[model samples]
Each structure stands twice: as structure tokens, then as C-alpha cells.
Target: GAMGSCRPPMVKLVCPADNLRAEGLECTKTCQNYDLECMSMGCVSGCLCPPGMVRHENRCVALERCPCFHQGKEYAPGETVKIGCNTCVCRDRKWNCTDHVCD
Candidate 1:
């Protein structure tokens, strides 16, 4: 004779990193999964690229692999420039930097 049988179910929990929020799953253009915002919670959720890198074509690409433009001038990939007192870096064919400030 058998009495009662009880069992627990298996589950998988995925949580965001410290100081970060869960944004579901994001697929990169090059076929990769990025699942969280790098910083601000107010910011859009997407692939969190590391420092000195930017999201390009669904992937985190190095600055050197992408070109940026400023003031109608093209800055080669991985180029850094100072405008007034602010610093700007070229990444992902874009400028991830500061605005111009004059003294």
C-alpha cells in the first residue's frame, strides 16, 4: 500500500545584476544576448557594453571598429578629442561624450 506523495517543482530564476534592473532579453545584430541596462534605470534597456565599447549592429564593438563624426568632421574609430574643456570618445560610429564648454 502507498500513502500520499508530494514533490516540489524545479524552476529557474533570472535576476538582474546589482544596481541594475531586469529588462527581459535582447538580441544583438550579430547574434548575442544582452540582458540589462548598464547604468541608469531611466535609460533604455539593451545590451550593456563595457567601458570603451559601444553597441553596434547588435553587438558590443570596440571604438576602433567604428567611426564617429563631430561638427561635420569624421573621427576615425577609437579616436578621442577635447572640445573646449570636455572630452569625447568615438565609439560605434558615434560620439559617446560630452558637450562643448567655453571659458
Candidate 2:
């Protein structure tokens, strides 16, 4: 017989998802056999929202869009550092919207 070879093989793998970046929440990859990434926007079981967005008045919205901040003024996270007018700076150390500081 002559030298011959079969077809290339196929591989499959499963990519785990975090709480927020999980199934319904969405993330990067389901069966990343060759290597793939995916992302989705939605509330996961215990997941939280990121910055540029906040939860106030019972709903999620942009920081500036929140009813707590005063218009024509700036806000900080909760420290001494001062922000700009169109910006937001929380007062005190508890204002930092670290992680997913919802509400």
C-alpha cells in the first residue's frame, strides 16, 4: 500500500462561566474547542453591574443619571481626591463604587 493518512482530528472543550458571566448572564465561550470568547449583558444570579452604571431609585442607570448626584457639580468615590463638575466623586471612604457597587 502507498503512504496515506486520514482526515484531521476534531477536539472539543467546555468553558466554565462565573456567576454573573454565566449562562443567562453571558460570558466568553461555551465549547471553546479551538479557543473562542463571548460576552453578554444581563443580571446573573449574584452578579453586579460595573461603573459608568449604577442602581438607584430601584433601577439601573448611569452615575450622572442617578437622582442622588447634584447637577452642575462633580462627585467622588469617598475620599479626598476631587473630581470635575461633569464627573462624580463620592464622599467618605464608603462612596467608592468598587467591584459591582449596585445601588
Candidate 3:
């Protein structure tokens, strides 16, 4: 006597450009590196941005494109902001400020 095996059907999964499929409970990377306490009791499946990239405005962007946060505010790259008589420019996800003496 021969026995038959049962298997589930194969489903094709295709992700968008620069995106990949992931399954499980994990923290997704975002532009702002905020401290988060992620706790999940179940698993989840979805697309995720690859390493060295972060999610910004519902899209994945390079690390260099990540925005800079200063004093509870977000600044885009190449944007110059004045802080205490010093000019700070957002570059490479960081603030480049000039050391100046303020009165």
C-alpha cells in the first residue's frame, strides 16, 4: 500500500523595489532613532526595509537621507538652522553647527 502526502499550495510573494518580506515581531527601523519599548505577543508578517535603510514617510530611504532631529524638531538635509548665534546645517542625518560666541 502507498500513502499520499499533503502539502499546502505555494504562494508567490513579490515585494517592491528595495523592500523585502519579513515575518515575526521586531522593531522596524525609522528615520528618527527614538527609544521604543516594543512588546508583542504574536508574530507579524510584512515588508521591511533592508539594513542601512530606514522608513521615512511610508517609504524607505538611505541612511544619508534620514532627517536630523534638533530640540524636538525635524530638519531636512542641507537645511540651515540658527541656534544661539550659531548656524547649524543638516547633513548626513546630523547637525553641523558652527562654534560661535553668543552675547
Top candidate (TM-score): 3
What do the candidate models score in CA lDDT, each in turn?
Answer: 0.50, 0.37, 0.58
- The alpha-carbon deviation from the true structure for residue 56 of candidate 2, after best TM-score superposition, in angstroms, is 1.3
Alpha-carbon RMSD of each model: 16.2, 18.4, 13.0
Q: Regarding lDDT, does 1 or 2 come out ahead?
A: 1
> Which candidate would rank higher by TM-score, 2 or 3?
3
Candidate 1 ranges with C-alpha deviation above 4 Å: 1-66, 98-103
Q: What's the TM for model 2?
A: 0.20
Q: Write the per-residue lDDT of candidate 1 for residues 1-103, one digit (tens) a residue.
A: 2232225434334555573655454322221212343443343333254444555444456545655646776656677987667787876555677566554
Better of 1 and 2 by TM-score: 1
| Model 3 lDDT on a 0 to 1 scale | 0.58
Q: Is candidate 2 or candidate 3 better by lDDT?
A: 3
